[PDB]
Amino acid sequence: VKIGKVTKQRDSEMYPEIAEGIMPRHRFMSAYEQRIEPPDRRWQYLLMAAEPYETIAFKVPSREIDKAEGKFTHWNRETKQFFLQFHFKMEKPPAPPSL
Amino acid sequence: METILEQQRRYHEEKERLMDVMAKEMLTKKSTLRDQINSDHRTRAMQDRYMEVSGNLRDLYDDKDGLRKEELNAISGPNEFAEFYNRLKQIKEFHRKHFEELLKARENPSEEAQNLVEFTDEEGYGRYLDLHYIN
Amino acid sequence: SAFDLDVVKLTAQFVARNGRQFLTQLMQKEQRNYQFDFLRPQHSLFNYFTKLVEQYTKILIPPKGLFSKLDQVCYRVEWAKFQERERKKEEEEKEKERVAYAQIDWHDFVVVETVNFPPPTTPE
């Protein structure tokens, strides 16, 4: 009982090389490391990546939100607990949902 | 008295167990079936037989299994034979075999001998095991 | 465990014909916490219960019908092999994912703003 969703859309059809192998991939990155190498940091980003398209980030000031407790214990790690736990990849329509 | 539901249940369950056993066997070494089936082919002409490639490569779908020696193939075939005998028997007996106040009535008698300190993990395990010698 | 087994299988026997009609009344009559737990999905054993009942429900299926039955066991084997193959493929895809995830620049940032799925990960 708390508060926690992103809807990322991809191209409209505009060699099996990771084409079906990997879904949208997300990772939580600390701003402690940036290309600037100066001025500011101190918050996290919910980065989302796909081979061709460019990476995307979302700032998370709140220390913890929607960080659940044993939602489902089935072990297909995929990439990590985060991805399997709370992501959906509508590959037929090319819509990546994350919550 | 004895609720037939439980008996018929146990029967269908055992049949399932046996099918699963001889299926596991047919799995580890497809030859077991293949061999058999081939012979069957020349006795009952109608019988459909698998793709030759499967037979040769000793595979059922994708994985090619290790070739076994004759003595073992035959052995397992006779074992499966007795298994099928058991199955046929159970199927037979089964064919020949196939309120609230009574619920509380029995649940009351279930209180009988409360002090029965003992672990009971031996119904499906003793059967599963009964059909799957050494240490 | 003979007691637990027996009560599970009995309440399962009645629950199979009367459903919750006799058990749903028993729970309120007797008042049992144990009975309530058995009825509930919280108590682990509940799951196995759902099994037994189903099984009994099955015996009710062909009552009045006889079974007059190798091919089958072969086909089952085949199935198992197939499933095994699916498992394998999955493992492979996962591997790919791990590789790519491990191999992309998590420092190529370009942010914009700042701040149930299980039934959704199906089709209808």
From Swiss-Prot, chain A:
It is found in: Nucleus. The modification Phosphoserine is found at residue 30. Transmembrane segments: none annotated. Component of the 17S U2 SnRNP complex, a ribonucleoprotein complex that contains small nuclear RNA (snRNA) U2 and a number of specific proteins. Part of the SF3A subcomplex of the 17S U2 SnRNP complex which is composed of three subunits; SF3A3/SAP61, SF3A2/SAP62 and SF3A1/SAP114. SF3A associates with the splicing factor SF3B and a 12S RNA unit to form the mature 17S U2 small nuclear ribonucleoprotein complex (17S U2 snRNP). Identified in the spliceosome 'E' complex, a precursor of the spliceosome 'A' complex. Identified in the spliceosome 'A' and 'B' complexes. Belongs to the SF3A2 family. Component of the 17S U2 SnRNP complex of the spliceosome, a large ribonucleoprotein complex that removes introns from transcribed pre-mRNAs. The 17S U2 SnRNP complex (1) directly participates in early spliceosome assembly and (2) mediates recognition of the intron branch site during pre-mRNA splicing by promoting the selection of the pre-mRNA branch-site adenosine, the nucleophile for the first step of splicing. This is Splicing factor 3A subunit 2. It comes from Homo sapiens (Human). The chain holds residues 110 to 223 of 464 of the full protein.
Swiss-Prot record, chain B:
The modification N-acetylmethionine is found at residue 1. It is found in: Nucleus speckle; Nucleus. Coiled coil: none annotated. The modification Phosphoserine is found at residues 54, 110. It comes from the Eukaryota. Ubiquitous. Belongs to the SF3A3 family. Component of the 17S U2 SnRNP complex of the spliceosome, a large ribonucleoprotein complex that removes introns from transcribed pre-mRNAs. The 17S U2 SnRNP complex (1) directly participates in early spliceosome assembly and (2) mediates recognition of the intron branch site during pre-mRNA splicing by promoting the selection of the pre-mRNA branch-site adenosine, the nucleophile for the first step of splicing. Component of the 17S U2 SnRNP complex, a ribonucleoprotein complex that contains small nuclear RNA (snRNA) U2 and a number of specific proteins. Part of the SF3A subcomplex of the 17S U2 SnRNP complex which is composed of three subunits; SF3A3/SAP61, SF3A2/SAP62 and SF3A1/SAP114. SF3A associates with the splicing factor SF3B and a 12S RNA unit to form the mature 17S U2 small nuclear ribonucleoprotein complex (17S U2 snRNP). Identified in the spliceosome 'E' complex, a precursor of the spliceosome 'A' complex. Identified in the spliceosome 'A' and 'B' complexes. This is Splicing factor 3A subunit 3. The lineage of its organism: Eukaryota, Metazoa, Chordata, Craniata, Vertebrata. The gene is SF3A3.
UniProtKB/Swiss-Prot annotation, chain C:
Changing residue 10 to K: Abolishes binding to SF3A3. The record marks 10 as: Critical for binding to SF3A3. Transmembrane segments: none annotated. Ubiquitously expressed. SURP motif repeats lie at residues 7-49. It comes from the Eukaryota. It is found in: Nucleus; Nucleus speckle. Component of the 17S U2 SnRNP complex, a ribonucleoprotein complex that contains small nuclear RNA (snRNA) U2 and a number of specific proteins. Part of the SF3A subcomplex of the 17S U2 SnRNP complex which is composed of three subunits; SF3A3/SAP61, SF3A2/SAP62 and SF3A1/SAP114. SF3A associates with the splicing factor SF3B and a 12S RNA unit to form the mature 17S U2 small nuclear ribonucleoprotein complex (17S U2 snRNP). SF3A1 functions as a scaffold that interacts directly with both SF3A2 and SF3A3. Identified in the spliceosome 'E' complex, a precursor of the spliceosome 'A' complex. Component of the 17S U2 SnRNP complex of the spliceosome, a large ribonucleoprotein complex that removes introns from transcribed pre-mRNAs. The 17S U2 SnRNP complex (1) directly participates in early spliceosome assembly and (2) mediates recognition of the intron branch site during pre-mRNA splicing by promoting the selection of the pre-mRNA branch-site adenosine, the nucleophile for the first step of splicing. SURP motif 2 mediates direct binding to SF3A3. This is Splicing factor 3A subunit 1. The gene is SF3A1.
